[PDB]
Design a protein around this nucleic acid. Structure first.
Ligand SMILES: [Mg+2]
Ligand SMILES: [Mg+2]
Ligand SMILES: [Mg+2]
Ligand SMILES: [Mg+2]
Ligand SMILES: [Mg+2]
Ligand SMILES: [Mg+2]
Ligand SMILES: [Mg+2]
Ligand SMILES: [Mg+2]
Ligand SMILES: [Mg+2]
Ligand SMILES: [Mg+2]
Ligand SMILES: [Mg+2]
Ligand SMILES: [Mg+2]
Ligand SMILES: [Mg+2]
Ligand SMILES: [Mg+2]
Ligand SMILES: [Mg+2]
Ligand SMILES: [Mg+2]
Ligand SMILES: [Mg+2]
Ligand SMILES: [Mg+2]
Ligand SMILES: [Mg+2]
Ligand SMILES: [Mg+2]
Ligand SMILES: [Mg+2]
Ligand SMILES: [Mg+2]
Ligand SMILES: [Mg+2]
Ligand SMILES: [Mg+2]
Ligand SMILES: [Mg+2]
Ligand SMILES: [Mg+2]
Ligand SMILES: [Mg+2]
Ligand SMILES: [Mg+2]
Ligand SMILES: [Mg+2]
Ligand SMILES: [Mg+2]
Ligand SMILES: [Mg+2]
Ligand SMILES: [Mg+2]
Ligand SMILES: [Mg+2]
Ligand SMILES: [Mg+2]
Ligand SMILES: [Mg+2]
Ligand SMILES: [Mg+2]
Ligand SMILES: [Mg+2]
Ligand SMILES: [Mg+2]
Ligand SMILES: [Mg+2]
Ligand SMILES: [Mg+2]
Ligand SMILES: [Mg+2]
Ligand SMILES: [Mg+2]
Ligand SMILES: [Mg+2]
Ligand SMILES: [Mg+2]
Ligand SMILES: [Mg+2]
Ligand SMILES: [Mg+2]
Ligand SMILES: [Mg+2]
Ligand SMILES: [Mg+2]
Ligand SMILES: [Mg+2]
Ligand SMILES: [Mg+2]
Ligand SMILES: [Mg+2]
Ligand SMILES: [Mg+2]
Ligand SMILES: [Mg+2]
Ligand SMILES: [Mg+2]
Ligand SMILES: [Mg+2]
Ligand SMILES: [Mg+2]
Ligand SMILES: [Mg+2]
Ligand SMILES: [Mg+2]
Ligand SMILES: [Mg+2]
Ligand SMILES: [Mg+2]
Ligand SMILES: [Mg+2]
Ligand SMILES: [Mg+2]
Ligand SMILES: [Mg+2]
Ligand SMILES: [Mg+2]
Ligand SMILES: [Mg+2]
Ligand SMILES: [Mg+2]
Ligand SMILES: [Mg+2]
Ligand SMILES: [Mg+2]
Ligand SMILES: [Mg+2]
Ligand SMILES: [Mg+2]
Ligand SMILES: [Mg+2]
Ligand SMILES: [Mg+2]
Ligand SMILES: [Mg+2]
Ligand SMILES: [Mg+2]
Ligand SMILES: [Mg+2]
Ligand SMILES: [Mg+2]
Ligand SMILES: [Mg+2]
Ligand SMILES: [Mg+2]
Ligand SMILES: [Mg+2]
Ligand SMILES: [Mg+2]
Ligand SMILES: [Mg+2]
Ligand SMILES: [Mg+2]
Ligand SMILES: [Mg+2]
Ligand SMILES: [Mg+2]
Ligand SMILES: [Mg+2]
Ligand SMILES: [Mg+2]
Ligand SMILES: [Mg+2]
Ligand SMILES: [Mg+2]
Ligand SMILES: [Mg+2]
Ligand SMILES: [Mg+2]
Ligand SMILES: [Mg+2]
Ligand SMILES: [Mg+2]
Ligand SMILES: [Mg+2]
Ligand SMILES: [Mg+2]
Ligand SMILES: [Mg+2]
Ligand SMILES: [Mg+2]
Ligand SMILES: [Mg+2]
Ligand SMILES: [Mg+2]
Ligand SMILES: [Mg+2]
Ligand SMILES: [Mg+2]
Ligand SMILES: [Mg+2]
Ligand SMILES: [Mg+2]
Ligand SMILES: [Mg+2]
Ligand SMILES: [Mg+2]
Ligand SMILES: [Mg+2]
Ligand SMILES: [Mg+2]
Ligand SMILES: [Mg+2]
Ligand SMILES: [Mg+2]
Ligand SMILES: [Mg+2]
Ligand SMILES: [Mg+2]
Ligand SMILES: [Mg+2]
Ligand SMILES: [Mg+2]
Ligand SMILES: [Mg+2]
Ligand SMILES: [Mg+2]
Ligand SMILES: [Mg+2]
Ligand SMILES: [Mg+2]
Ligand SMILES: [Mg+2]
Ligand SMILES: [Mg+2]
Ligand SMILES: [Mg+2]
Ligand SMILES: [Mg+2]
Ligand SMILES: [Mg+2]
Ligand SMILES: [Mg+2]
Ligand SMILES: [Mg+2]
Ligand SMILES: [Mg+2]
Ligand SMILES: [Mg+2]
Ligand SMILES: [Mg+2]
Ligand SMILES: [Mg+2]
Ligand SMILES: [Mg+2]
Ligand SMILES: [Mg+2]
Ligand SMILES: [Mg+2]
Ligand SMILES: [Mg+2]
Ligand SMILES: [Mg+2]
Ligand SMILES: [Mg+2]
Ligand SMILES: [Mg+2]
Ligand SMILES: [Mg+2]
Ligand SMILES: [Mg+2]
Ligand SMILES: [Mg+2]
Ligand SMILES: [Mg+2]
Ligand SMILES: [Mg+2]
Ligand SMILES: [Mg+2]
Ligand SMILES: [Mg+2]
Ligand SMILES: [Mg+2]
Ligand SMILES: [Mg+2]
Ligand SMILES: [Mg+2]
Ligand SMILES: [Mg+2]
Ligand SMILES: [Mg+2]
Ligand SMILES: [Mg+2]
Ligand SMILES: [Mg+2]
Ligand SMILES: [Mg+2]
Ligand SMILES: [Mg+2]
Ligand SMILES: [Mg+2]
Ligand SMILES: [Mg+2]
Ligand SMILES: [Mg+2]
Ligand SMILES: [Mg+2]
Ligand SMILES: [Mg+2]
Ligand SMILES: [Mg+2]
Ligand SMILES: [Mg+2]
Ligand SMILES: [Mg+2]
Ligand SMILES: [Mg+2]
Ligand SMILES: [Mg+2]
Ligand SMILES: [Mg+2]
Ligand SMILES: [Mg+2]
Ligand SMILES: [Mg+2]
Ligand SMILES: [Mg+2]
Ligand SMILES: [Mg+2]
Ligand SMILES: [Mg+2]
Ligand SMILES: [Mg+2]
Ligand SMILES: [Mg+2]
Ligand SMILES: [Mg+2]
Ligand SMILES: [Mg+2]
Ligand SMILES: [Mg+2]
Ligand SMILES: [Mg+2]
Ligand SMILES: [Mg+2]
Ligand SMILES: [Mg+2]
Ligand SMILES: [Mg+2]
Ligand SMILES: [Mg+2]
Ligand SMILES: [Mg+2]
Ligand SMILES: [Mg+2]
Ligand SMILES: [Mg+2]
Ligand SMILES: [Mg+2]
Ligand SMILES: [Mg+2]
Ligand SMILES: [Mg+2]
Ligand SMILES: [Mg+2]
Ligand SMILES: [Mg+2]
Ligand SMILES: [Mg+2]
Ligand SMILES: [Mg+2]
Ligand SMILES: [Mg+2]
Ligand SMILES: [Mg+2]
Ligand SMILES: [Mg+2]
Ligand SMILES: [Mg+2]
Ligand SMILES: [Mg+2]
Ligand SMILES: [Mg+2]
Ligand SMILES: [Mg+2]
Ligand SMILES: [Mg+2]
Ligand SMILES: [Mg+2]
Ligand SMILES: [Mg+2]
Ligand SMILES: [Mg+2]
Ligand SMILES: [Mg+2]
Ligand SMILES: [Mg+2]
Ligand SMILES: [Mg+2]
Ligand SMILES: [Mg+2]
Ligand SMILES: [Mg+2]
Ligand SMILES: [Mg+2]
Ligand SMILES: [Mg+2]
Ligand SMILES: [Mg+2]
Ligand SMILES: [Mg+2]
Ligand SMILES: [Mg+2]
Ligand SMILES: [Mg+2]
Ligand SMILES: [Mg+2]
Ligand SMILES: [Mg+2]
Ligand SMILES: [Mg+2]
Ligand SMILES: [Mg+2]
Ligand SMILES: [Mg+2]
Ligand SMILES: [Mg+2]
Ligand SMILES: [Mg+2]
Ligand SMILES: [Mg+2]
Ligand SMILES: [Mg+2]
Ligand SMILES: [Mg+2]
Ligand SMILES: [Mg+2]
Ligand SMILES: [Mg+2]
Ligand SMILES: [Mg+2]
Ligand SMILES: [Mg+2]
Ligand SMILES: [Mg+2]
Ligand SMILES: [Mg+2]
Ligand SMILES: [Mg+2]
Ligand SMILES: [Mg+2]
Ligand SMILES: [Mg+2]
Ligand SMILES: [Mg+2]
Ligand SMILES: [Mg+2]
Ligand SMILES: [Mg+2]
Ligand SMILES: [Mg+2]
Ligand SMILES: [Mg+2]
Ligand SMILES: [Mg+2]
Ligand SMILES: [Mg+2]
Ligand SMILES: [Mg+2]
Ligand SMILES: [Mg+2]
Ligand SMILES: [Mg+2]
Ligand SMILES: [Mg+2]
Ligand SMILES: [Mg+2]
Ligand SMILES: [Mg+2]
Ligand SMILES: [Mg+2]
Ligand SMILES: [Mg+2]
Ligand SMILES: [Mg+2]
Ligand SMILES: [Mg+2]
Ligand SMILES: [Mg+2]
Ligand SMILES: [Mg+2]
Ligand SMILES: [Mg+2]
Ligand SMILES: [Mg+2]
Ligand SMILES: [Mg+2]
Ligand SMILES: [Mg+2]
Ligand SMILES: [Mg+2]
Ligand SMILES: [Mg+2]
Ligand SMILES: [Mg+2]
Ligand SMILES: [Mg+2]
Ligand SMILES: [Mg+2]
Ligand SMILES: [Mg+2]
Ligand SMILES: [Mg+2]
Ligand SMILES: [Mg+2]
Ligand SMILES: [Mg+2]
Ligand SMILES: [Mg+2]
Ligand SMILES: [Mg+2]
Lengths: 59, 110, 141, 77, 200
RNA sequence: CUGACUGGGGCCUGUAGAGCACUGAUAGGGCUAGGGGGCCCACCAGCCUACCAAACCCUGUCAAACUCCGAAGGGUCCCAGGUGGAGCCUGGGAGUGAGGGCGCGAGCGAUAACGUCCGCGUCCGAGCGCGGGAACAACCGAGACCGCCAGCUAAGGCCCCCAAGUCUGGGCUAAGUGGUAAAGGAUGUGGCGCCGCGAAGACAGCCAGGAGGUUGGCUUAGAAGCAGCCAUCCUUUAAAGAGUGCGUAAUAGCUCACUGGUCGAGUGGCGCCGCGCCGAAAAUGAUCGGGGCUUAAGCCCAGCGCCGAAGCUGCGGGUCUGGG
RNA sequence: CGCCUCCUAAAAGGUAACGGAGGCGCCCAAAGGUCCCCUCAGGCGGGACGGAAAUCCGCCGGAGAGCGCAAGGGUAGAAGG
RNA sequence: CGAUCAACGGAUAAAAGUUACCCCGGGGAUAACAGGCUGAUCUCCCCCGAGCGUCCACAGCGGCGGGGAGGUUUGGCACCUCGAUGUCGGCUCGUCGCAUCCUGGGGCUGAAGAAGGUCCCAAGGGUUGGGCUGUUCGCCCAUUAAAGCGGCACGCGAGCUG
RNA sequence: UCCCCCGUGCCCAUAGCGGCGUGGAACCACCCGUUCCCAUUCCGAACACGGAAGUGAAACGCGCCAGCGCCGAUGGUACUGGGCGGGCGACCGCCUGGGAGAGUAGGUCGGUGCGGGGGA
């Protein structure tokens, strides 16, 4: 179970903890995608800023 | 609704709870006197002794001395030396005191 | 008018007018009732007018049922002073009312007289008003 | 017109300093309270001002006994 | 005397969605069963404005079940004065506490003086079986002056019913009426300022 | 790999909401000392209390300093994930300790401040650099290493000023509302219900009647239907209240309702929702930024593209760090 | 203008105003320590002077008592006497 | 052991004020003038109608109570100006808003008629001379078609006045 | 290792209050005494002691009765973490998740641990 993550919006003006989640996922630029293994320890990260991001399901 | 009897049985055993030692439980009826030692942590009684179960006849003072002298032996046979003495609501006098001397002369440590 | 004879404290904070009324939303006293809509602090100086006008309209009979009470003391500083130097002095006793409250219930009075009697309060009160008859929903709770 | 208020006492930093499952050492303070809002359990030392400290080096665990109040227990690992 | 209605079941719908579409959500239950249902409002207000909890309402499920029911509680919206939830009891031969309305007959004596008849309890809590249900309870109020107290101990009961409250409850009273000449003296005195409680 | 941060897990907790179990508030009600009043004595109580009302109860309510209850959240530890101008022990070098706008809660204020003081966050400060927004530090979009007369989008726009639709589909507005506001008033109008009345002929218009006890009474000086009220009951009826408004010093009178006819089908009144009218008067010359748009160039729902930022990709190379 | 308690204070800590509220600058030789002994305020009924309320008794009765002093916290299965 | 070193993290064991004779260095961080924001207050307007108005809820009136505009009153905060923004009153010069004092056109009238109270549209002109005092205001004098209220830094000292 | 029974823990009213019945052989409890030990801020009340004729009337134990109290869902709703809008404002809506309290349905006249007496 893998998930290709694609950022949709910029993190400007949003609280700092959400920025720390974006850094935990390793998002330093816009539109960058990354396929990550599906575990709740990483899914709970994306659940926070889900409104700024998009996720695709792979394998 | 509590009474002075239940309060006196409560307060002294509350004092004994901080000791954590093996408690010498005393129950004195009009006919007999009963004593079984329990572990307050795990709620398991070690051994028992009394006068009715030992088929005693008359005066509960010397009879209580007898039940002490009969209780302490099994304690020295199971390896129980350091102990405490709880009186409950009864005053430390007469029958219960003669029982205490029965245990101390029986070989316990209190 | 209305004011408590004794109180624990003479001053209170303003709180918040958020949410709907937690009680007094269904008619349980009289045939008809008046429900308020807008939130506001309701002074006894505002209540006495509606009450007095309604009993001046009845002139006998019927019963006025007040379901609220002015438990909120209102404060104000003296005129032409600076911010600070203590909190303003308490000059009135008001009541918090939010959407859903039924302040007044009336019985022993027929529909029409109830209609105009409840109509005077619509103007003599600052909040929007709505006239209700006690139906099965007010009887149910 | 003047003020009669504005006077107050400093805060006492009241609460519990060690939670359930944490590592403690002999003498480390556990709880601060006024009166008996807690009651000492196993290996729970307490002084005169109701300061609860660690009696031994162990792990922390809490329980509520209902009418007898909440108790703490410091287990040997 | 007796009323009927039609209902349908609901499993995976938003209660706000159905409630906006006009389908009031609900859950019917008794000591033997439990189910989630929904009933339309425009067909609910017409029947409920007449027999709220005083009469019987049997519901018809989509499969064809006809169950004699009685609404136990109604959760009204605290803003719009529109019901946002309902509870439905499922009846049987077992007796249970319910409510019944009171019909007050007779012209009171105090009313003829322009008085006011306050009705504390137009409904009474009484335990009875659904088969022994009376539609209401008749009480004579023609001997009411200004003013004496009437209570629940004065009730005459049709056979088979059991009063579920203490008889000391006052069900009605006659209250002093308003007056213009009372307002002149109502302002004839000043009430004392609130005497605060001395702290410490 | 110990970090901000994410998941499992146990613990710590008492504000929003909630409620009477304590302390207070408490309108009405039921009970009952107590008195006040009043029949009734100095002869001592008794009885009535449409009198305020102790205690206790009921119906319905309130509280930052009330709590029989109590989350979302907050913290901490355990372990896993997670490797980043992340974290940590020691050493040297500072700058600041005038903040500000906004958002969420609260107070102070006057449910005022381009007001102030607090906790949390963002941002401006230091990003007056960039697109919007007419320009405008903090509203929305977006963090600029620079070089391309290339490409895609965010906010926002797509009638001209000005790049992109006078693009389609439904429905709404007639007030240029749009394009500054209220309690309130309204034959404004559109979308859903509820109804009754009416060819056991309604509403509109057209044709008769609309009477008596009785100038009723508490009743005072007139009160004759037409002043308040502790009266509203009836008679003859196709129909008539002991009277809707107008009218009199009372009268007198006209008329509403009303029943019948006349014409032959819809009518009128309550409750919800969209958008509008009056409410709306101030000082240098006008105005939504303008020009000007009414099956819109406006409001609502609903689609397929495009424009467009220094935001992301292609491509040309600087430099700090990292793998080789 | 130093200190304590309430809340403001937004369920850890903490958090300011000239915000809303009361207290302190003393005392106890036992009112400290240890053993043992014991439970209230309040409502129903009785009773010398003598009681709304002096003391005692009978029934109910979890903390509404009280613990030098404001406040909260705590509390008789005592910390109270 | 000496603490109202009670300004309580405590200068020294020794300590009030006055300054229109004032100076230096500063502040728009910080009052007085001015604008700004607020409209607490003040001005003006509208809601509902008890009642007065002989009768008659509105001819005019409008208890208790409620919704707002204007930024002309006093104040609130101290936001640009203290390397200055000259403070009240008067003289002069105009222009501007109508909540209109007169004049024009009107509804209502408790309008016989004259005169008039109240409500409507309307800024075009007009809106006199003086005693008092610094006065703005205001009382009074003789008139008047009337002798209006407000804006422009409570307009106007790089125009005077002082 | 089955019943009843004597202590003694735990769970912390699902365990209390009230009302009804019931059990003395053992036990247990009242009871018989106040000389002895001790005791009464008076009192053999309780406490203490020596006993064993009487006694289930009390209390206690064992069971029924749900009047009161206790416990309490299904929901929906309140509030709110995160994400969004409207409204001049007071404040109001939508998405994601958590989800009360009150009431309603009804459940409760206890459950169990060890050691001890007799019974089976
Ligand atoms: Mg994209
Ligand atoms: Mg932003
Ligand atoms: Mg966090
Ligand atoms: Mg956060
Ligand atoms: Mg960062
Ligand atoms: Mg960076
Ligand atoms: Mg991966
Ligand atoms: Mg998992
Ligand atoms: Mg999950
Ligand atoms: Mg999932
Ligand atoms: Mg989480
Ligand atoms: Mg997911
Ligand atoms: Mg999302
Ligand atoms: Mg208890
Ligand atoms: Mg031996
Ligand atoms: Mg040892
Ligand atoms: Mg008064
Ligand atoms: Mg409220
Ligand atoms: Mg309620
Ligand atoms: Mg207000
Ligand atoms: Mg007010
Ligand atoms: Mg007033
Ligand atoms: Mg007012
Ligand atoms: Mg003054
Ligand atoms: Mg004054
Ligand atoms: Mg001054
Ligand atoms: Mg006042
Ligand atoms: Mg005032
Ligand atoms: Mg006031
Ligand atoms: Mg007042
Ligand atoms: Mg009636
Ligand atoms: Mg009717
Ligand atoms: Mg309306
Ligand atoms: Mg209604
Ligand atoms: Mg003052
Ligand atoms: Mg003064
Ligand atoms: Mg003075
Ligand atoms: Mg002081
Ligand atoms: Mg003072
Ligand atoms: Mg003082
Ligand atoms: Mg004082
Ligand atoms: Mg504090
Ligand atoms: Mg400290
Ligand atoms: Mg536990
Ligand atoms: Mg628990
Ligand atoms: Mg306890
Ligand atoms: Mg354990
Ligand atoms: Mg374990
Ligand atoms: Mg291990
Ligand atoms: Mg809807
Ligand atoms: Mg609909
Ligand atoms: Mg029954
Ligand atoms: Mg009078
Ligand atoms: Mg009265
Ligand atoms: Mg009088
Ligand atoms: Mg008055
Ligand atoms: Mg008088
Ligand atoms: Mg008078
Ligand atoms: Mg009075
Ligand atoms: Mg007087
Ligand atoms: Mg006066
Ligand atoms: Mg006063
Ligand atoms: Mg005073
Ligand atoms: Mg005092
Ligand atoms: Mg005193
Ligand atoms: Mg006192
Ligand atoms: Mg670690
Ligand atoms: Mg942080
Ligand atoms: Mg940091
Ligand atoms: Mg963390
Ligand atoms: Mg794990
Ligand atoms: Mg677990
Ligand atoms: Mg009272
Ligand atoms: Mg009187
Ligand atoms: Mg009660
Ligand atoms: Mg929970
Ligand atoms: Mg958590
Ligand atoms: Mg935090
Ligand atoms: Mg910590
Ligand atoms: Mg572990
Ligand atoms: Mg470990
Ligand atoms: Mg790793
Ligand atoms: Mg690396
Ligand atoms: Mg590294
Ligand atoms: Mg590094
Ligand atoms: Mg660094
Ligand atoms: Mg470092
Ligand atoms: Mg470290
Ligand atoms: Mg070194
Ligand atoms: Mg360092
Ligand atoms: Mg340093
Ligand atoms: Mg400063
Ligand atoms: Mg500052
Ligand atoms: Mg700051
Ligand atoms: Mg700030
Ligand atoms: Mg703010
Ligand atoms: Mg946001
Ligand atoms: Mg926030
Ligand atoms: Mg005010
Ligand atoms: Mg407010
Ligand atoms: Mg404002
Ligand atoms: Mg504000
Ligand atoms: Mg502010
Ligand atoms: Mg801050
Ligand atoms: Mg937060
Ligand atoms: Mg930045
Ligand atoms: Mg910019
Ligand atoms: Mg804008
Ligand atoms: Mg604009
Ligand atoms: Mg906005
Ligand atoms: Mg702005
Ligand atoms: Mg070129
Ligand atoms: Mg993009
Ligand atoms: Mg445009
Ligand atoms: Mg252009
Ligand atoms: Mg451009
Ligand atoms: Mg408009
Ligand atoms: Mg405007
Ligand atoms: Mg405006
Ligand atoms: Mg707008
Ligand atoms: Mg509006
Ligand atoms: Mg209207
Ligand atoms: Mg006929
Ligand atoms: Mg005929
Ligand atoms: Mg709609
Ligand atoms: Mg509307
Ligand atoms: Mg509108
Ligand atoms: Mg306009
Ligand atoms: Mg205007
Ligand atoms: Mg217009
Ligand atoms: Mg203009
Ligand atoms: Mg304009
Ligand atoms: Mg435009
Ligand atoms: Mg719409
Ligand atoms: Mg679209
Ligand atoms: Mg196309
Ligand atoms: Mg580029
Ligand atoms: Mg770039
Ligand atoms: Mg290609
Ligand atoms: Mg290169
Ligand atoms: Mg190189
Ligand atoms: Mg390095
Ligand atoms: Mg490496
Ligand atoms: Mg390699
Ligand atoms: Mg200081
Ligand atoms: Mg606090
Ligand atoms: Mg800490
Ligand atoms: Mg720390
Ligand atoms: Mg801090
Ligand atoms: Mg500060
Ligand atoms: Mg002193
Ligand atoms: Mg003491
Ligand atoms: Mg006593
Ligand atoms: Mg104290
Ligand atoms: Mg205290
Ligand atoms: Mg204890
Ligand atoms: Mg000295
Ligand atoms: Mg000295
Ligand atoms: Mg000195
Ligand atoms: Mg000094
Ligand atoms: Mg001093
Ligand atoms: Mg000094
Ligand atoms: Mg000195
Ligand atoms: Mg001096
Ligand atoms: Mg001095
Ligand atoms: Mg001086
Ligand atoms: Mg001088
Ligand atoms: Mg001078
Ligand atoms: Mg001077
Ligand atoms: Mg000189
Ligand atoms: Mg000089
Ligand atoms: Mg000189
Ligand atoms: Mg100088
Ligand atoms: Mg200063
Ligand atoms: Mg000054
Ligand atoms: Mg100052
Ligand atoms: Mg001066
Ligand atoms: Mg001055
Ligand atoms: Mg001043
Ligand atoms: Mg100024
Ligand atoms: Mg201006
Ligand atoms: Mg000003
Ligand atoms: Mg403005
Ligand atoms: Mg205003
Ligand atoms: Mg304004
Ligand atoms: Mg007017
Ligand atoms: Mg009148
Ligand atoms: Mg009149
Ligand atoms: Mg007149
Ligand atoms: Mg007026
Ligand atoms: Mg008056
Ligand atoms: Mg007025
Ligand atoms: Mg007023
Ligand atoms: Mg007003
Ligand atoms: Mg007002
Ligand atoms: Mg207003
Ligand atoms: Mg304006
Ligand atoms: Mg002026
Ligand atoms: Mg002036
Ligand atoms: Mg003046
Ligand atoms: Mg003044
Ligand atoms: Mg001034
Ligand atoms: Mg400032
Ligand atoms: Mg200069
Ligand atoms: Mg100057
Ligand atoms: Mg000069
Ligand atoms: Mg000057
Ligand atoms: Mg001056
Ligand atoms: Mg002046
Ligand atoms: Mg002059
Ligand atoms: Mg001159
Ligand atoms: Mg001039
Ligand atoms: Mg002029
Ligand atoms: Mg104009
Ligand atoms: Mg006018
Ligand atoms: Mg005129
Ligand atoms: Mg004219
Ligand atoms: Mg005229
Ligand atoms: Mg004239
Ligand atoms: Mg006049
Ligand atoms: Mg002019
Ligand atoms: Mg003009
Ligand atoms: Mg012109
Ligand atoms: Mg001219
Ligand atoms: Mg001119
Ligand atoms: Mg002129
Ligand atoms: Mg002039
Ligand atoms: Mg002149
Ligand atoms: Mg002036
Ligand atoms: Mg002038
Ligand atoms: Mg002049
Ligand atoms: Mg003056
Ligand atoms: Mg004069
Ligand atoms: Mg004179
Ligand atoms: Mg003269
Ligand atoms: Mg003259
Ligand atoms: Mg003149
Ligand atoms: Mg002028
Ligand atoms: Mg001015
Ligand atoms: Mg001048
Ligand atoms: Mg001079
Ligand atoms: Mg001079
Ligand atoms: Mg066997
Ligand atoms: Mg069996
Ligand atoms: Mg256990
Ligand atoms: Mg069970
Ligand atoms: Mg109980
Ligand atoms: Mg019994
Ligand atoms: Mg009861
Ligand atoms: Mg529970
Ligand atoms: Mg979070
Ligand atoms: Mg709207
Ligand atoms: Mg604004
Ligand atoms: Mg409001
Ligand atoms: Mg979770
Ligand atoms: Mg209840
Ligand atoms: Mg059962
Ligand atoms: Mg048991
Ligand atoms: Mg259990
Ligand atoms: Mg057991
Ligand atoms: Mg056996």
């Amino acid at each position: 179970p893998r998930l290709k993550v694609k950022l949709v919006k910029s993190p400007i003006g949003y609280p700092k903890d959400q920025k720390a989640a974006l850094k935990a996922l390793g998002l330093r630029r816009l539109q960058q995608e990354r396929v990550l293994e599906d575990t709740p320890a990483i899914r709970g990260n994306v659940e926070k800023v889900a409104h700024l991001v998009r996720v695709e399901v792979v394998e | 609704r509590l009474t002075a009897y239940e309060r006196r049985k409560f307060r002294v055993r509350n004092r004994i709870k901080r000791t954590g030692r093996l408690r010498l439980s005393v129950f004195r009826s009009l006919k007999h006197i009963y004593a079984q030692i329990i572990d307050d942590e795990k709620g398991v009684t070690l051994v028992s002794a009394s006068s009715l179960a030992l088929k005693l006849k008359g005066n509960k003072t010397e009879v209580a001395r007898q039940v002490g002298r009969a209780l302490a032996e099994k304690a020295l046979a199971l390896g129980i030396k350091q102990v405490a003495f709880d009186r409950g609501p009864y005053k430390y006098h007469g029958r219960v005191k003669a029982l205490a001397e029965g245990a101390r002369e029986g070989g316990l440590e209190f | 008018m209305l004011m408590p004879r004794r109180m624990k404290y003479r001053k209170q904070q303003r709180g918040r007018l958020k949410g709907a009324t937690k009680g007094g939303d269904y008619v349980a006293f009289g045939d008809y009732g008046l429900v308020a809509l807008e939130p506001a602090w309701i002074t006894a100086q505002q209540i006495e007018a509606a009450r007095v006008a309604m009993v001046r309209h009845f002139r006998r009979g019927g019963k006025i049922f007040i379901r609220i009470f002015p438990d909120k003391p209102y404060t104000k500083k003296p005129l032409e002073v600076r911010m600070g130097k203590g909190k303003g002095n308490v000059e009135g006793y008001v009541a918090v009312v939010k959407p859903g409250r039924v302040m007044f219930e009336v019985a022993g009075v027929t529909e029409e007289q109830a209609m105009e009697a409840l109509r005077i309060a619509g103007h003599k009160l600052p909040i929007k008003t709505k006239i209700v008859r006690r139906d099965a929903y007010d009887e149910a709770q | 017109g003047s003020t009669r208020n504005g006077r107050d006492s400093q805060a006492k930093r009241l609460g519990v300093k060690r939670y359930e499952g944490q590592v403690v050492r002999a003498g480390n303070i556990l709880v601060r309270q006024r009166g008996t809002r807690f009651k000492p359990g196993k290996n729970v030392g307490m002084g005169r001002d109701f300061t609860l400290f660690a009696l031994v080096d162990g792990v922390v665990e809490f329980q509520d006994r209902g009418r007898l109040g909440r108790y703490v227990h410091v287990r040997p690992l | 005397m007796e009323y009927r209605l039609k209902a349908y079941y609901r499993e995976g719908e938003k209660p706000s969605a159905l409630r906006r579409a006009g389908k009031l959500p609900g859950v019917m239950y008794n000591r033997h069963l439990n189910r989630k249902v929904y009933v339309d409002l425009v067909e609910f207000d017409k029947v409920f404005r007449q027999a709220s909890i005083h009469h019987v309402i049997v519901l018809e499920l989509p499969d064809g079940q006809s169950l004699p029911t009685l609404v136990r509680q109604v959760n009204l919206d605290k803003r719009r004065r529109r019901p946002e939830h309902v509870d439905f009891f499922v009846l049987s031969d077992e007796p249970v506490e319910m409510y019944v309305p009171l019909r007050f007959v007779g012209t009171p004596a105090g009313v003829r003086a322009g008085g006011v008849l306050q009705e504390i309890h137009r409904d009474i809590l009484v335990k009875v079986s659904p088969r022994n249900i009376p539609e209401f309870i008749e009480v004579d109020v023609s001997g009411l002056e200004i003013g004496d107290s009437l209570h629940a101990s004065d009730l005459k009961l049709p056979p088979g019913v059991e009063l579920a409250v203490s008889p000391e409850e006052t069900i009605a009273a006659v209250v002093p009426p308003e007056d213009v000449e009372k307002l002149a003296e109502e302002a004839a005195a000043e009430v004392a300022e609130p005497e605060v409680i001395k702290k410490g």
